[PDB]
Design an enzyme around this catalytic site. Structure first.
Site, PDB file in Angstrom:
ATOM      1  N   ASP A  48      -6.576 -17.186  -3.049  1.00  0.00           N
ATOM      2  CA  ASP A  48      -6.420 -16.040  -1.934  1.00  0.00           C
ATOM      3  C   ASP A  48      -7.586 -15.034  -1.797  1.00  0.00           C
ATOM      4  O   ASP A  48      -7.723 -14.490  -1.025  1.00  0.00           O
ATOM      5  CB  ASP A  48      -5.177 -15.358  -2.020  1.00  0.00           C
ATOM      6  CG  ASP A  48      -4.990 -14.346  -3.064  1.00  0.00           C
ATOM      7  OD1 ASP A  48      -6.136 -14.208  -3.935  1.00  0.00           O
ATOM      8  OD2 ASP A  48      -3.900 -13.537  -3.158  1.00  0.00           O
ATOM      9  N   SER A  50      -8.517 -13.109  -4.233  1.00  0.00           N
ATOM     10  CA  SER A  50      -8.481 -11.875  -5.131  1.00  0.00           C
ATOM     11  C   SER A  50      -8.922 -12.580  -6.691  1.00  0.00           C
ATOM     12  O   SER A  50      -9.053 -13.958  -6.602  1.00  0.00           O
ATOM     13  CB  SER A  50      -7.108 -11.440  -5.408  1.00  0.00           C
ATOM     14  OG  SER A  50      -6.258 -12.549  -5.921  1.00  0.00           O
ATOM     15  N   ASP A 101       7.677  -2.134 -10.941  1.00  0.00           N
ATOM     16  CA  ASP A 101       7.601  -2.253  -9.157  1.00  0.00           C
ATOM     17  C   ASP A 101       8.833  -3.114  -8.828  1.00  0.00           C
ATOM     18  O   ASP A 101       8.963  -2.955  -7.637  1.00  0.00           O
ATOM     19  CB  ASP A 101       6.407  -2.863  -8.828  1.00  0.00           C
ATOM     20  CG  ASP A 101       5.974  -2.719  -7.543  1.00  0.00           C
ATOM     21  OD1 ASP A 101       5.841  -1.610  -6.941  1.00  0.00           O
ATOM     22  OD2 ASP A 101       5.551  -3.836  -7.033  1.00  0.00           O
TER      23      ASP A 101
END
Ligand SMILES: [Cl-]
Ligand SMILES: [Co+2]
Length: 129
Positions: A48, A50, A101
């Protein structure tokens, strides 16, 4: 820096990861082994665009800024290069945010696929903590 297994376990304990959000120290050592082979300088590009950085392979799309990941949220508020230091403080502080998270350590694919459900206590066996 390439850590030894027990050396990393001790550093992680000092920085408060043992039982952080209920994950025993062996989980963290196992994750580091399979993410980075205990090498603070590890980097890996993703499809992607990243990049993953450091001993826990923290991603530039969500967690740190590397200047080349458009739309990066930089939720740990740090340059990604800070995650490559011989001092693991920044990686640990950021990892604590990630594990909080909602998905726990499932955020780390190597942990899910290689550590989860295994005898993770083996990773700290023999160590003087
Ligand atoms: Cl959890
Ligand atoms: Co990754």
């Amino acid at each position: 820096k390439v850590f030894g297994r027990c050396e990393l376990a001790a550093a992680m304990k000092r920085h408060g990861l043992d039982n952080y959000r209920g994950y025993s120290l062996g989980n963290w050592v196992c994750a580091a082994k399979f993410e980075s082979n205990f090498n603070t300088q590890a980097t890996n590009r993703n499809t992607d665009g990243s990049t993953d950085y450091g001993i826990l392979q923290i991603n530039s799309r969500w967690w740190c800024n590397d200047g080349r990941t458009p739309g990066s949220r930089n939720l740990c508020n740090i340059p990604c290069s800070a995650l490559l230091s011989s001092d693991i403080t920044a990686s640990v502080n950021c990892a604590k945010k990630i594990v909080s998270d909602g998905n726990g350590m499932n955020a780390w694919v190597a942990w899910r696929n290689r550590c989860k459900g295994t005898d993770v206590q083996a990773w700290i066996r023999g160590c003087r903590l």
